[PDB]
Amino acid sequence: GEQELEGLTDTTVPKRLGPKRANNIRKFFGLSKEDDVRDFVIRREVTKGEKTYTKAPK
RNA sequence: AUCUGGUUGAUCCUGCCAGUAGUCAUAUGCUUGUCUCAAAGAUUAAGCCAUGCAUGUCUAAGUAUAAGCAAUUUAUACAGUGAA
After folding, report:
1. Separation of CA A56 and C1' B21 in angstroms?
2. Cys-Cys link to A31, which of A23, A26, A57, A58 (CB 3.0-4.6 A)?
């Protein structure tokens, strides 16, 4: 409507997982046919102590 | 491959009732030191049941971004192990 809601209209929770199938990635970026996809994959970083690692899907 | 006691004052018979041994055949009574081997809720009620267990499973080789761990390092797709 017109007014705002304190917990329901203000925040934005981000999604948990990007795409995995190769054609299903090119849909998400709108890339063309002749483009390599394996340089266009979302990566997630995680660190315990001082070890910055990288999770990335197969 | 065997027989003995009992009918009459006495004797020969027909005849059955005691006796006598066996049982991987069950209980029961009094006793009971050793080695080996061992059945065991069938009979009566295929009656009733407290609690716990008895069916789950992975290799180099179907699916891992665990906000798992190991970090260890050639590896920017992923590659070690590995819950759900």
Report:
1. 95
2. A26
